[PDB]
């Protein structure tokens, strides 16, 4: 064989070049700065109304509204300041495992195992929430719908491919292929020019929304990656997988910067989200709880103690005021 | 504060709607249909009457949702937990493929998949309704194909009853959580319309068992 040898040798030289150019670890530089100590967080508000496992959530752009997807085929919009149910959207398919909120607040797209990403229009002259368009063309279970603007949304799916859509026309404008495993999450860059996605092949890949070429790839995880999000400046991102390790990568360093694992943790990570200042990384774990790590010291500076079931989703507001958490116990808790 | 009060009242009305919808959804039976693909699950879904398929049917004033998810073509580890809490798992195994192969024969693959589903972490209190397909075909085939082809440790005549009992016992033995849940085996019939009746009886048994467990008396 020839192709196998070429791929193996190319991997060899790129690995050697990346290893040789490593100067020092993140801790080696950032050890000097003082730590954060103990961070006390308490459930300011608690949200009731879901009657099944909550699989995903997404904060509004005004940092006051919420959206939650649960196994009972319900989509609720929460007034987080007053814990009021703004909207309740009966989904056509009850097998939802991800969904998000439009940056303009006009739309919500929410879908799952039925291989359909439904778009919902909130601001209707009819007074209710109607389905805008159903995006079809994925052959595997869906994950991490993410609006770019009012008329284009990028989604990942269990058929090893991500896609950029065009809600006006409904056809898959651009296709992102290359994953050798089910892609489980994707996070949009703050600039909405790039994004990253983690897959079940224990790899994360950086993709360009306009050209659709594989710009960069990241390794280091041993199991399937289920959570990922960008650093607030758009120059780094953290991944979480089932091997109970969170890792911070830099898009320009092209190699892992830091590991966020401890011996006590045995279960993997379900959700990952960052604080506004880019220092406090929140990670919701499989067992029952979330851990609030210092994104520079790799030290667990606080734990969110609630959620008598597995926590599935996290969200940090744009203004950074609070952190909303959703768990399989059908309860959303705001911590501030 | 008048607008806030009206918002709270609208929230309360929405919440009563969700409560009523939960009441409606709590009195319906959830079955997860599983098999090896070529196990004649199509005959089953026909007798009851891409991505995930729901089959809805009412029998004896009981509403049944059955989820056929065999066409996912994805790792089961990532989406099986979405069914943790179904009333029952309807498993289907063909009896004709004891000698037929897909390497190895298909019956051993079915046994492995059944062991994986039954001993799955997320299914501890979820009961299984087991169906055995191709009754007449299996009875006819053993007349010339000995069962020693599939199982070399078998010791019995090439009769329908002994082989069927041996297969049922072999499926039973893979279960190791015998004290919490059990396997409810049935042999499929064509014109009796008894598969639906057996499913109804098994789900009724499961419902009564959950009630007794909740009441603390059991």
């Amino acid at each position, epitope marked *: 064989d020839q192709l196998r040898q070429e791929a193996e040798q190319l991997k060899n030289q790129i690995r050697d070049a990346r290893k040789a150019c490593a100067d020092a670890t993140l801790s080696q530089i950032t050890n000097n700065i003082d730590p954060v100590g103990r961070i006390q967080m308490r459930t300011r508000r608690t949200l009731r109304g879901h009657l099944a496992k909550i699989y995903a959530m997404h904060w509004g752009t005004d940092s*006051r*509204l919420l959206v939650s997807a649960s196994q009972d085929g319900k989509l609720i919009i929460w*007034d987080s300041y*007053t814990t*009021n149910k*703004v*909207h309740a959207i009966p989904l056509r398919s009850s097998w939802v495992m991800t969904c998000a909120y439009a940056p303009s*607040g006009n739309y919500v797209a929410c879908g799952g195992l039925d291989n359909i990403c439904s778009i919902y229009n909130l*601001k209707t*002259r*009819e*007074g*209710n929430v109607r389905v805008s368009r159903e995006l079809a063309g994925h052959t595997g279970y869906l994950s991490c719908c993410r609006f770019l603007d009012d008329n284009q949304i990028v989604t990942s799916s269990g058929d090893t491919t991500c896609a950029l859509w065009d809600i006006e026309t409904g056809q898959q404008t651009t296709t992102f292929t290359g994953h050798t495993g089910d892609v489980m999450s994707l996070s949009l860059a703050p600039d909405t020019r790039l994004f990253v996605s983690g897959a079940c092949d224990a790899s994360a890949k950086l993709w360009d929304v306009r050209e659709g070429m594989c710009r960069q790839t990241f390794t280091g995880h041993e199991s399937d990656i289920n959570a990922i999000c960008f650093f607030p400046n758009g120059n780094a991102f953290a991944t979480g997988s089932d091997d109970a390790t969170c890792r911070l990568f830099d898009l320009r360093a092209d190699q892992e910067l830091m590991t966020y694992s401890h011996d006590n943790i045995i279960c993997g990570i379900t959700s990952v989200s960052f604080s506004k200042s880019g220092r406090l990384l929140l990670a919701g774990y499989d067992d029952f709880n979330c851990n609030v790590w210092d994104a520079l010291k790799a030290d667990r500076a606080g734990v969110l103690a609630g959620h008598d079931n597995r926590v599935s989703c996290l969200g940090v507001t744009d203004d950074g005021m609070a952190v909303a958490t959703g768990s399989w116990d059908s309860f959303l808790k705001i911590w501030n | *504060s*008048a*607008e*806030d*009060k*009206a*918002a709270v*009242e*609208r929230s*309360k*009305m929405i919440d009563r709607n969700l409560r009523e919808d939960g009441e409606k959804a709590a009195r319906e039976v959830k079955l997860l249909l599983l098999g090896a693909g070529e196990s004649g699950k199509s005959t089953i879904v026909k007798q009851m009457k891409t991505g995930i398929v729901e089959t809805h049917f009412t029998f004896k004033d009981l509403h049944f949702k059955m989820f056929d998810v065999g066409g996912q073509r994805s790792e089961r580890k990532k989406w099986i937990h979405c069914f943790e809490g179904v009333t029952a798992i309807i498993f289907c195994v063909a009896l004709s493929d004891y000698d037929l192969v897909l390497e190895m024969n298909r019956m051993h693959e079915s046994m492995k998949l059944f062991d994986s589903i039954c001993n799955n972490k997320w299914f501890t209190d979820t009961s299984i309704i087991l169906f055995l397909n191709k009754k007449d075909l299996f009875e006819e085939k053993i007349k010339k194909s000995p069962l020693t082809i599939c199982y070399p440790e078998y010791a019995g005549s090439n009769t329908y009853e002994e082989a069927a009992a041996y297969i049922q016992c072999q499926f039973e033995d893979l279960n190791k959580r015998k004290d919490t849940k059990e396997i409810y085996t049935h042999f499929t019939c064509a014109t009796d319309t008894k598969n639906v009746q057996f499913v109804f009886d098994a789900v009724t048994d499961v419902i009564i068992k959950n009630n007794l467990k909740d009441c603390g008396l059991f």
Partner: single-chain antibody, 232 residues
Framework: VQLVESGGGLVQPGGSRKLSCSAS????????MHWVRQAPEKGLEWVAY????????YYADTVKGRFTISRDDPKNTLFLQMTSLRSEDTAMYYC??????????????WGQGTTLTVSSSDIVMTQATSSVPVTPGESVSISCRSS???????????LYWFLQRPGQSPQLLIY???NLASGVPDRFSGSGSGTAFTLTISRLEAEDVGVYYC?????????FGAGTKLEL
């Protein structure tokens, strides 16, 4: 969206009539409904309000105990029942919808209304003038003042600006200070503080003439302004 009213006409005093409002084109069961009235060239005056599902019911001080507000959600129709009618009840009645949640425009659509003629604490808002001439292309500033400070502790002040063109029904323009309604041109803008409220129009056109009204919610009952008429 279309709200159609019926039941008006000429009635002897002390008699009884019933006003019906037929809704067709929106989710009626999720919208609270107001009955508002406008006397002949006097001004708008709130009459009644019934919430979604008839959970909450509010009446005006001047009429409480004489009218009956009714809802038929199955049929998407609104009712207003009248027992005793004086000479002050002669007015055009408008059936208005209102939905309340975080960010809604709770006076979006006004019905066309019907006329009813009869044979012969509260926050007060005042507008300074009643006739302002202006040429199109000239910016126009209007203002009104209230007694109480409508700025609630929530952070938003509950002030509403409506426009009524000659021969037409009112159109919602502003619902707090600067949040424009849906389908309204950008040229309108509003601001103010506490009690003093101003509405500015840049590059006015001939179709922007009519009578402007400023109203407060903040509390029930709802009170309107005097109404200022522009001329051209």
């Amino acid at each position: 969206v279309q709200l159609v009213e019926s039941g008006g006409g000429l009635v002897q005093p002390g008699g009884s009539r019933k006003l019906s409002c037929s809704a067709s084109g929106f989710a009626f069961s999720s919208f609270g409904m107001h009955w508002v009235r406008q006397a002949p060239e006097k001004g708008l005056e709130w009459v009644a309000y019934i919430s979604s599902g008839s959970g909450t019911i509010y009446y005006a001080d001047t009429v409480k105990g004489r009218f009956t507000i009714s809802r038929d959600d199955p049929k998407n129709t609104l009712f207003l029942q009248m027992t005793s009618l004086r000479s002050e009840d002669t007015a055009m009645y408008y059936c208005v919808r209102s939905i309340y949640y975080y960010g809604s425009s709770p006076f979006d659509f006004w019905g066309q209304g019907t006329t009813l003629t009869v044979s012969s604490s509260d926050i007060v808002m005042t507008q300074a003038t009643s006739s302002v001439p202006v040429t199109p292309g000239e910016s126009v500033s209007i203002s009104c003042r209230s007694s109480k400070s409508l700025l609630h502790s929530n952070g938003n002040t509950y002030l509403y600006w409506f426009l009524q063109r000659p021969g037409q029904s009112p159109q919602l323009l502003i619902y707090r200070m600067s949040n424009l309604a849906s389908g309204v041109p950008d040229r309108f803008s509003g601001s103010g503080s506490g009690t003093a409220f101003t509405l500015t129009i840049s590059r006015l056109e001939a179709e922007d003439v009519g009578v402007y009204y400023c109203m407060q919610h903040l509390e029930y009952p709802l009170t309107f302004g005097a109404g200022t008429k522009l001329e051209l």
